[PDB]
């Protein structure tokens, strides 16, 4: 459910990213925990920059971020979403 990215369907992963992008949490601490979780799931070298400091031309909407992660994982030899 929460141990690796392969435990997420794409739709569930979008829900996580949407929650982070909208700061839809009870406290700052809870948001920081969620962002750390995201970084551990993607394993992307840019870390939280994917959410907060996009590269030029990169779509930082929730759907945009999910696409960037999905493509990066696929291009770099890693397992993807459930189903």
């Amino acid at each position: 459910l929460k141990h690796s990215i392969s435990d997420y369907t794409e739709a569930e992963f979008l829900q996580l990213v949407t929650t982070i992008c909208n700061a839809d949490t009870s406290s700052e601490e809870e948001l920081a925990k969620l962002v750390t979780h995201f970084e551990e799931m993607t394993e992307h070298p840019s870390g939280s920059d994917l959410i907060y400091y996009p590269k030029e031309g990169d779509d930082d909407s929730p759907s945009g971020i999910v696409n960037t992660v999905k493509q990066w994982r696929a291009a770099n030899g890693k397992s993807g979403f459930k189903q």
Partner: protein
């Protein structure tokens, strides 16, 4: 328990800043409190330093010249009075957001709510300051 938890009124002028405001937070003594923010907060009473911090980020969220340089996700954060996330390379572990620093330390008699004594820092820069 801590001196930053006693109520006080915000004071001080702050300084003119530009589009590079938050880039300054990872250098030297940090970035100053913008003159524009200081104008909004001056003479207001705050219950704790943490309450003052929330107020700063809420005013940044409403400020066109200061918020324009944050992305939609960071905007959502400051609208809640949360501190904005820094670039990954300025984070240190669980410390991932901009931190407010007292230039003359409170433990050394510095003023808690004097905006001329407050700086915005990244986690990496702030830790280094207090390590000498």
């Amino acid at each position: 328990e801590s001196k930053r938890n006693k109520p006080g009124k915000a004071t001080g002028k702050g300084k003119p800043v530009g589009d590079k405001w938050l880039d300054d937070a990872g250098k030297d003594s940090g970035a100053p409190i913008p003159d524009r923010i200081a104008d909004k907060l001056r003479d207001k009473e705050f219950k704790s330093f943490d309450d003052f911090r929330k107020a700063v980020w809420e005013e940044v969220s409403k400020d066109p010249e200061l918020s324009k340089n944050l992305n939609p996700s960071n905007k959502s954060s400051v609208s809640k009075g949360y501190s904005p996330f820094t670039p990954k390379n300025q984070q240190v572990g669980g410390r991932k957001v901009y931190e407010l620093h007292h230039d003359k330390p409170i433990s050394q008699g510095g003023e808690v709510y004097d905006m001329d004594n407050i700086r915005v820092t990244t986690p990496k820069r702030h830790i280094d300051i207090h390590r000498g």
